[PDB]
Amino acid sequence: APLRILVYSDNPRTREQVRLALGKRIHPELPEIEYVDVATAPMAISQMDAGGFDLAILDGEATPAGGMGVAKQVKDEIDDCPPILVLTGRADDAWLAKWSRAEAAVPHPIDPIRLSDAVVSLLR
Amino acid sequence: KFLDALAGFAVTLGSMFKKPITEGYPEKPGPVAPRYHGRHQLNRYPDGLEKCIGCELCAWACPADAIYVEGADNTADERYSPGERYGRVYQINYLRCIGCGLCIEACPTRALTMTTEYEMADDNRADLIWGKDKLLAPLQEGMQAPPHDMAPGKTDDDYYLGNVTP
Amino acid sequence: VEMVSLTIDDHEISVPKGTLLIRAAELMGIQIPRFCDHPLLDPVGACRQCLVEVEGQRKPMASCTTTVMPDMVVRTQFTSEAADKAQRGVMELLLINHPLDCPICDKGGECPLQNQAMSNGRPETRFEDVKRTFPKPISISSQVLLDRERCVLCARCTRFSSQIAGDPFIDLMERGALQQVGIGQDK
Amino acid sequence: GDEPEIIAVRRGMFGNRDTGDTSGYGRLVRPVALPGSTPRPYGGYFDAVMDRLAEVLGEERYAMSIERVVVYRDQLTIEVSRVQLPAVASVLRDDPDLRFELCLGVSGVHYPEDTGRELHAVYPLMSITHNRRIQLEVAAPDADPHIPSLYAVYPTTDWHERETYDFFGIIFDGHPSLTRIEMPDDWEGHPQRKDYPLGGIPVEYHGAQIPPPDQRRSY
Amino acid sequence: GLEERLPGGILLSTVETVAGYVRKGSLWPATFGLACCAIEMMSTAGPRFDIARFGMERFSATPRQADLMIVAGRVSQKMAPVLRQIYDQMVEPKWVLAMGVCASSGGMFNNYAVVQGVDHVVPVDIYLPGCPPRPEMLLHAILKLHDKIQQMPLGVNREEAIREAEQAALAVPPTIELKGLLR
Amino acid sequence: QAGERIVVNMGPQHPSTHGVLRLILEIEGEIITEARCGIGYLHTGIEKNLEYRNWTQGVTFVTRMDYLSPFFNETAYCLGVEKLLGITDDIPERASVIRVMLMELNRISSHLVALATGGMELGAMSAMFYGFREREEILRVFESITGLRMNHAYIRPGGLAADLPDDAITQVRRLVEILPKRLKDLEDLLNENYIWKARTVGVGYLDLTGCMALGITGPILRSTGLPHDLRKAQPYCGYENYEFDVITDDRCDSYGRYIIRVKEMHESVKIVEQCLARLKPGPVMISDKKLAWPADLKLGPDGLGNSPEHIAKIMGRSMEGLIHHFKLVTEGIRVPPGQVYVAVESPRGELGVHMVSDGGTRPYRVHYRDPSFTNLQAVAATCEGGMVADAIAAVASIDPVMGGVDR
Ligand SMILES: CC(C)=CCC/C(C)=C/CC/C(C)=C/CC/C(C)=C/CC/C(C)=C\CC/C(C)=C/CC/C(C)=C/CC/C(C)=C\CC/C(C)=C/CC1=C(C)C(=O)c2ccccc2C1=O
Ligand code: SF4
Ligand code: SF4
Ligand code: SF4
Ligand code: SF4
């Protein structure tokens, strides 16, 4: 089946950048990727509560609610939560990314190949 | 007499017959000091020309990097301030501004002042990045639109010396 | 590599034959104020900003043009009160006609004139008269805008465009207080 | 040597950290020297202190222990030699003529451009009985940032020595437990070092952003 | 809760109005000062003003009872886990007020040590400038939060509002792209 | 053994711990057996962030460190800058008098906050409100003089950011008149109150030897009877010309510290009276224009700004004036290279500042030996063996302001 990836960010350009790094089919040895984009913490949480996601990418720099806070929340609140990848706006934010318990963390600006490799590692 | 240990009671009882001292904000806001570091304001000369010359000295001095200024040329077709420069873009990030006042002391034209207005809060990170059009002081009476030539015969020096009128 | 030894201020150093006083004072850590000097331009000693007292010399000498001789003694503004007075007077004369343009001048913050007026200038103006004025800016090309009032007439632009590049399409023009860097007419 | 410590070497006029915004001004070479050792008659009680110290220590021990003496702005700095720090501190605290009871703390200061002396720990000591105060300074290399802890002599230093480690990596050997006090135990790097980046983020603005102060130009 | 499962007619509307009224009128803060802004928060509770006037005298010491979090200070890195723990340990509904430039965006301390906005770790309801915001500004921000609380949907209305807000949010161009007269 | 002792966090988020202080207590039922201290929950990077700003700008940072004693932090910073510049002997008398007046009013304010927070910690709820009424009385003066309620940037290298507003002196005279009475109203709640004394007498005992060993200073040290105050020993900013009594106690415990603070408030009122007495008109900034802060703030119908006279001077007449304004505002003074450790008697003890300059316009190093940081070494001594309720009283008595602790 297609994999659904929740990409969370209120910056549209970061969402487009994530969708560019990950094509419809990343690593052609892998299934097709379906993108549900969310720009608000409540919607991201509700979509996670719906479930069925293989990975969620949470922009650590999301304005009204950072992706690290959402990451910790989703790991505390959804049973069988899918692996979380975080985009960090700062190198010193790594520690918080460690605290967010996200399986991986990709610093801004989104490096396409680095993000694709991280995702493939999480979705494999 | 052991009464001293009870003095506190005398206090609290007494206070519950003296009138409460609370300021009645917001129905009756309190008097903030005249010198208070309120919201920055961009001012104009009496003819309406913007005082700011876009020198970025205010932003230079800001310890918080809370001011962003881009200068641009005044020209006859469009003049915003006396002289060759004016602040085309003027943003203050009030979620970085610490109200220190160093900007004011930095400004060489008194274009930047601090009002006593202080009420400010918004639900958006971005709604508190106040732009030039939010900051420019209200177009007082006798002023004309900012895009116009200097007062007839007057020159930037005449403006800085205060020798201008509507 | 004939080395000549001399004392600048109280201290002593040894430098290649032919080295200028300003270069030596640079090498020993002393900031002699300077505008017209340039290491890569032939010295011109025009602005007279870099004056220093030299032993056996009645007049102050432009350190930018004074070739080092053996056994010379030199005292900069850091130790020569006379040299200090000379430099500060040159600074004042340099600022009297200068526009009050620092907020609008692009060079503001990176201006050698500002910095050296701080380090080697009087606290405030003594000049209550009328400043020289030019209509400004004026383009000397599609790229370069000239502001003649701010020009300290150091001739570094002209000296570069002649010595370094064979492009004397600007020169010092007019005379006296009216001297100004300029292109020919419209070329 | 009596030559001063150069913590930095400014190149060019106007404090340019790099090539410079105007040509021909970058040729100056101004070393940034801290004050050198004061000649001898140290002002005020300083002589009275140091002489007493030189008496309590031997000539050989005093010469091996005290690397430099610097009086600056009527403040006495004893640039003490590493390794010998506990002995000198014990002498200062215990000697009735010195009796510097109160060590006020430890402050690290990083001089990456000072060869072999990159990290300096400063110990402000005060003698309440004599109403005196001085500052010990111990220099350690970056490659061997180990300094002897003064814990046995000044327990007050325990936290300071910890913070200084956390912030500079100065390893106070012999300290009970040099755990980070301010930063998380898992934190990487020592922030107060110059090599550590400021770790700021750009300030946002409508259509623009201002990079942190450590990225933008300075003089 | 059952109160949100009411039919979308007048019952749910009136319940929303009354619940918003009550929650805005009894917005107990958590006893969670951090820094300078914590002192100004105490000053706001102090007699010269009276935060108690707005039903907010009870600074709840236990997160369980607290319905509001005035961050009111600078969230260091080492504090973000603790601040998040306290937030998560309040019981819903809960709102967060980023008091001060430090709490809202990191303020002057654009550094490694500071998180640069609690928004990184907890959802922020209202941002409050100032360094520190004077108590009148804190009361203003709290009144703006009262207005936000009163106009709060519930149940099916809550879901519809989340959908509408999500759709609207997807379109706003990012702040870095709002190039105005900026050449 | 283990099984009868619990390990608990007084934790950051706790009403008595100021939100960012973590006391890890090993308690045998409810007696404190060990009191580990966890710090850095308020670390802000100020000491490093300073290094990327000019002098006279780092002031805005330092006042944020120990936010209850802003004027003390600023005075320490600016005195360090002046000592480095060698300008300590050239500062105007009026600036020094205003500095003493502001530091002492700040001492009153800081002790009021200490007493309020302690009293509410120990259940004395009305202590908070009465102490904060008194504190607001002083914060109005601070707002008038500086335009800010806290984190003022009023005290600047070589003087002050500006001179007192014309009404300021009368506001401070009113303070000198009323602070005795309002402070007495506060004292009626606590001073002789049987429950308050029972709650702090003998509690948090710390020997003079303990204070010396941990480097304690301020009220904690002076509660041991030692009359050590940096204002009398090692005078600074002209305290030599003020008549005031070094407040000391013999109890060596929490109540002794409380009484020391209550009396230090009165001594501050007395020094403020003296300041007003010896406050003659004059400049507030060094006359050396090469270093003096060039801005002259003045109010108008359009708010606080540069005085129009200054604008005229630097934009129409004075070229050297314009250059000096531009450079001192943007680049700022550059201090001669060197080190200096300068200490002040902050309300919580010997607030020291190690300042290092590399000849540049930005500080090379500014390390604050904040007294609160060292005083928190006394949590073990003053809490271990006592009751947890008594440990709260001890910690309150230390009066730790965590901003200065973590900086
Ligand atoms: C036609 C006609 C006349 C009809 C009349 C019908 C009518 C109105 C009925 C009256 C009889 C009733 C009420 C029957 C209905 C059924 C019923 C009793 C339901 C109860 C439901 C329930 C358990 C709870 C819902 C709310 C409710 C109405 C409960 C009872 C009333 C109260 C007051 C209960 C709880 C509230 C309470 C006492 C405490 C709240 C907690 C706190 C901390 C209070 C506030 C507070 C305190 C107490 C501090 O200590 C404090 C100290 C310093 C600073 C600030 C504070 C602070 O904020
Ligand atoms: S507000 Fe003042 S300092 Fe800022 S750009 Fe305008 S004129 Fe310059
Ligand atoms: S008040 Fe201070 S921080 Fe705010 S814009 Fe002005 S100078 Fe910058
Ligand atoms: S324009 Fe030419 S002569 Fe004038 S200051 Fe510049 S380099 Fe010197
Ligand atoms: S925003 Fe300003 S006043 Fe508030 S805690 Fe931070 S530094 Fe202090």
Ligand code: FES
């Ligand atoms: S630099 Fe020597 S005279 Fe100009």
